[PDB]
UniProtKB/Swiss-Prot annotation, chain B:
Top-rank lineage group of the source organism: Eukaryota
S-S pairs: none
Sequence ranges assigned to domain SH3 in this UniProt record: 1-52
Tissue specificity as recorded in UniProt: During the cellular blastoderm stage, isoform B, isoform F, isoform H, isoform I and isoform L expression is localized to the cell borders. From stage 11 onwards, expression is found predominantly in the developing nervous system: axon bundles in the ventral cord and the brain. Stage 14 and 15 embryos exhibit expression in the developing body wall muscle. Expression in neuropil regions of the CNS and at NMJs persists through to larval development. Other isoforms show expression in embryonic epithelial cells.
Transmembrane annotation, as ranges: none
Family note: Belongs to the MAGUK family.
Included stretch of the parent chain: 622 to 966 of 970
General function of this protein: During embryonic development, some isoforms are essential for proper neuronal differentiation and organization. Required for cell polarity; maintenance of apicobasal polarity. Plays a critical role at septate junctions in cellular growth control during larval development. The presence of a guanylate kinase domain suggests involvement in cellular adhesion as well as signal transduction to control cellular proliferation.
Record protein name field: Disks large 1 tumor suppressor protein
Domain Guanylate kinase-like: 69-244
Localization per Swiss-Prot or TrEMBL: Cytoplasm; Cell membrane; Basolateral cell membrane; Cytoplasm, Cytoskeleton
Organism: Drosophila melanogaster
Gene: dlg1
Phylogenetic classification of the source organism: Eukaryota, Metazoa, Ecdysozoa, Arthropoda, Hexapoda
Amino acid sequence: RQDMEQLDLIKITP
Amino acid sequence: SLYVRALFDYDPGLPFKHGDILHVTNASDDEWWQARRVLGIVPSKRRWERKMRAVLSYEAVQRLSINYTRPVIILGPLKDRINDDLISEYPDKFGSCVPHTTRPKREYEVDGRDYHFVSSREQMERDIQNHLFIEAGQYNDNLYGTSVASVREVAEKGKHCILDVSGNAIKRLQVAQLYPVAVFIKPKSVDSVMEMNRRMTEEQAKKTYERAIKMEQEFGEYFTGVVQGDTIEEIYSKVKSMIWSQSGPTIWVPS
């Protein structure tokens, strides 16, 4: 999946 | 009383590697422990922590009987190649999850095959805040993520869920009680990185090497194993051996 190769990851709190 | 995971390599006395489980048979001495190694003398926790403060030392662990098949996270340079090898050569042993996205479904796409499509960005944000995802990220202003439930489905049907995720996901899976095999493949040198990736220059390989050293530091408490080797084939053997060894029904988990 092309889009998944291109993610800016978001931090999961906590 | 007392098994620990070593979080560093020790070359003395009992040699061990980052990730090894040690049975500590005597901890009476403040400076030195006697230890067995569940496949000699080792520095006590306080001694090693003094050396490093001048911090990853030991993590207490215990046996667990589990009732699911463990997810697998491979990290380090070579992870993409090894993940590809595993899922392609062993399709009956590994499964992958279907991720969620808020991007619109396109004409030839199938919900539940390409993605689980989420109609509202705000709803996916709520789900992320409610810990329904082990990892999430943004691309072209849409959200994407791998859900706890998608991993649980694979684990429960009896396959190892091969996950292309970052180190922060390991913690999320431990909280969910879906303990992953988390193997870091550690490069020996910039030379070695070039040897096994004749594509890169010695600037690209150096950056890759640097990034790996930092990753091992950042996530060193969360690995269940560390593998090294002089060839891809040696590495791949060691990864399969580690997956097998850490598969249980009986497994080691944090205490």
